[PDB]
Amino acid sequence: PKEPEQLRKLFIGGLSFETTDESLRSHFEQWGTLTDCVVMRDPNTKRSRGFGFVTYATVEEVDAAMNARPHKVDGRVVEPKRAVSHLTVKKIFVGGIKEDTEEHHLRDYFEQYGKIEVIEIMTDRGSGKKRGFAFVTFDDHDSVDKIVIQKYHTVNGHNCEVRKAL
Numbered sequence: 052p053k054e055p056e057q058l059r060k061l062f063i064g065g066l067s068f069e070t071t072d073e074s075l076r077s078h079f080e081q082w083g084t085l086t087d088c089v090v091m092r093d094p095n096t097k098r099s100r101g102f103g104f105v106t107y108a109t110v111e112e113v114d115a116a117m118n119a120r121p122h123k124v125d126g127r128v129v130e131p132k133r134a135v136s137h138l139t140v141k142k143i144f145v146g147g148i149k150e151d152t153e154e155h156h157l158r159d160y161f162e163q164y165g166k167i168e169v170i171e172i173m174t175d176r177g178s179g180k181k182r183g184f185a186f187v188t189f190d191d192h193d194s195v196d197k198i199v200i201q202k203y204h205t206v207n208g209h210n211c212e213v214r215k216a217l
């Protein structure tokens with residue numbers, strides 16, 4: 052069974068207006084099989100709108116392409132992003148971690164999604180007791196995008212609610 056097509060797409064902004072279906076494809080085929088590759092254009096002038104998308108055969112290929120950023124395509128650094136259910140943020144809210152979850156639990160789990168810069172385990176302003184949620188800040192938005200499309204996150208035995216923050 053193939054992963055849903057929506058999860059295999061990269062939406063690419065910042066294209067050179069000279070980039071074509073063919074040159075976008077030749078670039079991004081370096082990181083996987085492309086089942087689709089389109090540059091968006093004006094319907095009357097055919098002038099590029101400056102963005103397009105590609106569709107890989109697997110999610111691992113999307114990962115490979117995203118790990119190969121920055122992408123310079125036809126002389127211009129472009130901006131690829133995956134689809135989320137774009138709100139481009141580097142921080143997540145992690146809820147449901149109760150009082151026994153520590154920083155290393157969150158680090159050990161989330162470090163495989165991306166490079167962590169901040170872990171903030173939330174505590175009560177009056178008592179100092181843990182409140183049962185945390186925020187994790189990464190150095191880049193793709194980590195967050197990968198995280199929030201998962202159906203499940205289990206951290207320290209807890210089923211966690213994870214969403215984009217601010």
Ligand SMILES: CC(C)c1ccc(CN2CCC(O)CC2)cc1
Pocket residue numbers: 062063064065091102103104
């Ligand atoms: C499916 C197709 C319509 C599509 C839509 C949107 C993008 C990316 N989007 C994000 C940044 C904006 O400034 C414009 C580009 C790429 C492709």
